A paper describes a structure:
The bromodomains (BRDs) usually serve as a module for recognition of acetylated lysine residues. The bromodomain and extra-terminal ([name]) protein family has four members, including BRD2, BRD3, [name], and BRDT. Under normal conditions, [name] is involved in the regulation of transcriptions. However, [name] has been found to be involved in various kinds of cancers and other diseases, for its regulation of several oncogenic and antiproliferative factors, including c-Myc and Bcl-2.
To reveal the binding mechanism and facilitate further optimization, the complex crystal structures of several compounds in this category with [name]-BD1 were determined. Compared to compound [name]-2141, compound [name]-2254 had improved potency due to the introduction of a hydroxyl group. The binding modes of these compounds in the pocket were almost the same, in terms of their shared part. These compounds formed direct hydrogen bonds as well as water-bridged hydrogen bonds. In addition, hydrophobic contacts were formed with the surrounding hydrophobic residues, including Trp-81, Pro-82, Phe-83, and Val-87, Leu-92, Leu-94, Ile-146.
Author numbering: 43 to 166
Write the structure that this text describes.
Amino acid sequence: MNPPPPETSNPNKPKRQTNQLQYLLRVVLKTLWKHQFAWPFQQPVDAVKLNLPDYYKIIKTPMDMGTIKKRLENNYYWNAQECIQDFNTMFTNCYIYNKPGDDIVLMAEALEKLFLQKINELPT
Ligand SMILES: Nc1cc(-n2ccnc2)c2cccc(O)c2n1
């Protein structure tokens, strides 16, 4: 049974649009989105469909690029570091649930190293 996906809006949370955050959507996410290994991360893990019934017993801070994309589109973040933490949560969760050298991990590691290249320099 899947849990509710993370929130993509919150009226109690302050919103902000920064140049670095606009770049995370325009440039960083939207190129990562099109990588051939992106598809497993474009939406919350469906642990029912995937027959991973232990997934949400292990992963208690789920995060995915579909959630991040909707957060960016919603101006949900206060700064770019908040978004970068979500990306790192997504990558870390994959490495926690899985084992080195698994197909899904090789996908995450390819996206993570792309992600690190793209955020190596942000606009000002
Ligand atoms: N064992 C798996 C399988 C996944 N997945 C989702 C769609 N195809 C593979 C997956 C996807 C994202 C994060 C993970 O930790 C995953 N772990």
